[PDB]
Amino acid sequence: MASVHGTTYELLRRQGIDTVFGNPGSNELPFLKDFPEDFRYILALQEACVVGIADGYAQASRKPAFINLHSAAGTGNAMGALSNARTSHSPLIVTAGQQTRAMIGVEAGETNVDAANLPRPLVKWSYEPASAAEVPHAMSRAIHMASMAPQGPVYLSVPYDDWDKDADPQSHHLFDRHVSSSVRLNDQDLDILVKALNSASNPAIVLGPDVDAANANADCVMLAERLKAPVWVAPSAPRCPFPTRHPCFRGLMPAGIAAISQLLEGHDVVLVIGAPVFRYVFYDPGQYLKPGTRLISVTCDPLEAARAPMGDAIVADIGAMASALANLVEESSRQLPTAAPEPAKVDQDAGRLHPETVFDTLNDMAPENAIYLNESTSTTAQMWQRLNMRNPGSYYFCAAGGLGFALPAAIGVQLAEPERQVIAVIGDGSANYSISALWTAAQYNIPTIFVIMNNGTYGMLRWFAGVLEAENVPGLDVPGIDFRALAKGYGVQALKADNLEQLKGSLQEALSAKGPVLIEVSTVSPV
Amino acid sequence: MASVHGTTYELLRRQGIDTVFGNPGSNELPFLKDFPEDFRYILALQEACVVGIADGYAQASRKPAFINLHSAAGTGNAMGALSNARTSHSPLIVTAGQQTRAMIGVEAGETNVDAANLPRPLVKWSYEPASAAEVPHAMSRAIHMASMAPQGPVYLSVPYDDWDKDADPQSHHLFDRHVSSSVRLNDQDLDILVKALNSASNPAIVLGPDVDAANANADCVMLAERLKAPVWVAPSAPRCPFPTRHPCFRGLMPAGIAAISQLLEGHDVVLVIGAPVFRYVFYDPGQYLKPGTRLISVTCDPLEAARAPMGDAIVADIGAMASALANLVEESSRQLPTAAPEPAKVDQDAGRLHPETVFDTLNDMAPENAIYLNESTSTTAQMWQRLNMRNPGSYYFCAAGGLGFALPAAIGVQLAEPERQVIAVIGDGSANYSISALWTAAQYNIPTIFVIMNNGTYGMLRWFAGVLEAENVPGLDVPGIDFRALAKGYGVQALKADNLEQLKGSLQEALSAKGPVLIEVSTVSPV
Ligand SMILES: Cc1ncc(C[n+]2csc(CCOP(=O)(O)OP(=O)(O)O)c2C)c(N)n1
Ligand SMILES: Cc1ncc(C[n+]2csc(CCOP(=O)(O)OP(=O)(O)O)c2C)c(N)n1
Ligand SMILES: [Mg+2]
Ligand SMILES: [Mg+2]
Ligand SMILES: [Mg+2]
For A132, what's the count of Cα atoms within 13 Å in the CB-facing half-sphere? Predict the structure, then answer.
């Protein structure tokens, strides 16, 4: 307890941390030594995997996740993953070991040069302490910065000789600090907003990932029912904020300016909750909103409020605001929206699987409290239409579009939610980015199901190339990957589905298995 | 070529670039479209692999390598690899596609936020142009910044709508620009240095990676022979700068302060060429130099000159300086140094392989012009003692200690040197970091030999834990990886060696094979 090591672990446990996601190195050994018995360590083989797992775990648990990486090389390997963490507002405490203070100036091997600048601009806060005794206070800042709205990844670099040094005896005041950002709009202005919602003749609601992060899903259901309002999920959705077969639900918005203003045409008040306004992707110029539509955004993120090209904004906690609004608005006497029609069953022969067939089969066979992850980039629209997701925390997709998220994140989610079957639907291209994460699932017996959609190509990129009139583009096809052999390589049970009969058979086997299972599915291909 | 696209490819070809190492994304399609017939594209499945391959290629070819990655996520995935590239002074031109200019402010999906700050502090230059017409001039800056001493990675972010825009007609002046940093110390001061070397009673030479980068190896042989001086390789060596069985050669320096000053005791003048002074790693306090020893460093890098804790320094081109010194110093009439003794042949039974046995066997069987890569971290000393490397460009080791270098870099080196057999000796832990690079070797039929040293553990970390008296450390063992299955997964021929007879058999097969080959070697293990 007298040491920085002892004091830091005490701070961590008192702040509710009990798991370390890591890949170790020399600079981290003085931190990891005498690893306390009330903590667990989750090893992954590459740092993109470490951070991916921790990210899934944080998102599903709705609590900060603690990460330990090796210096610049380890931090650097994780920076694509940190890109995703930024956009999903994932509360990640990223720590990295630094060389001993005496060896920094000469730039010894393993020195993290100008360390705090390395993860910038992706992190909320980034720091290397000026002394050993400062380390617990620096850790306190990291914990709270990650945890306060808008939540996000933070970075702390610690010289390895710091851990053995005497702690400041006054560091005890850090242990039980409670910091809240659970705030909502003042009574007067909240009343004005509620009045505007009550007065709307044709309101619409758009929900984003911070709704699911806040577990505000049920309150948003109540709000939608009271306002009798259609509900969309904001484009490029990292999470699912609403039951997908509720009568109000209208699906995933296309990531385009004109496309969204068209969907919102005729709606006089559009209430956006917990979403950027908006995560557009494709070139689709036009009006941000059509005449007669006003927009009000509730966001936990000042930068989201600042960068919205239209509408009013309120910067507040999504949980507190959704609860306030759901409980304050009048019950409208308008007709409840009609449920969206069932998607068509596509023609399926005895050959390669249409993605539509895969999602239909999953929906038929998976438990109702399944959790899905998506990194099958060309099939996102079909997935959203065909999976009935009733419960919160049921969907995750790389928040910044960074591939290599879903495979490790599915392992972290499954760890956070041992009673809910996790099924990751991942493209053949996407599977390779963080392929080594499979080993963590096998070693810790984390029973994630991985469904590899093998069409031999970067399907989404072919679609983008068509849109952009981009001809003669190299590097779009990925033939000759045996995913069963890869799963075997990392100790994961592997199955193949070349047709529907095999798909049903493989899913049946996977859903009854005691460990992780990979199913390679032969899907229809433009190759 | 009226477009930015046409002008930029013309600049690239006129500057000698003909290969693009990449993993494509949406923002890169307008750059990659109409890919010119005089260029080749080398696809890798993850960006650490892309950069690793390009790095190996650049180091072996002694020319800049051109890289194309996807936005923040792709750049981020490659940042551990950029750490290595920084320390090896690798001339890498890293380009990344950005969102269209119109969609940056709203932060559309695939936007690289504050892009130029992302790869900092790892790169020597980092930039996003303010207009489309500036792109060729920005590319020109990138090419020359990467190429001038001290060589290093650079970063350029380009909004994807820039490529179709009209180029500045004055961009033609960029095409044939020749920029030289091939400089040496002025005559007067060079004369003073030569006189100091001539006057030394007991000189020693220490060489670093910039010697091999400069192909200054032969000049350093001449210098060592003229001075009759023992030659060491500077600690944490990324490259081999000297024939390892030349009588002057004294091997790899231990990465410690006291250890190095002890080796240099009695030497009145120590000439360091092309190395930092020094890449110490382990805690080993003492004198930087013992009384009676003075040090003179020749470095291509101002930061290396600035941060040396001792000695005089000259900042100049390594090729020009080695050539000048080798040709100006008098031939000493001192006795030529005695060659280092043979390493002992360790006892080897019919069971698991001692690393010593592996290197002895490789040295017996590999061609004299083989190129070795090292990422078997616990066996580095044994490797240096047991492999006779006569030629330049014969050795590569992760410059910043960042794992995941050797496997992809071995593919790049083999591409650069099709007539020299590349053999990568990689630990079981290290193999996973960039495992997907194997696919590139299979798809382009790049006949690299991968030797996996499988001891089931992070061996070097166990050693570090003993030095630091770090007990109860989690995450040090990596059981249950089948490397043959992994190689099969990516289409690479796979062999196993459980004993010496099998090792000899597997190496014989690998050396006669037409494609890439992985050999999993069961090595001796502390568990
Ligand atoms: C780290 C990273 N690299 C590259 C990309 C660009 N990218 C976006 S979608 C895609 C295709 C993925 O292919 P696959 O997983 O097979 O799914 P499909 O598109 O075939 O459905 C690529 C390479 C990215 N978003 N992130
Ligand atoms: C990207 C990265 N992650 C982690 C480390 C820390 N590290 C250094 S050596 C090592 C062990 C590598 O094990 P292996 O490849 O099996 O070789 P061995 O030590 O067993 O010879 C690790 C994890 C690093 N240098 N870089
Ligand atoms: Mg695909
Ligand atoms: Mg940075
Ligand atoms: Mg090992």
Answer: 21
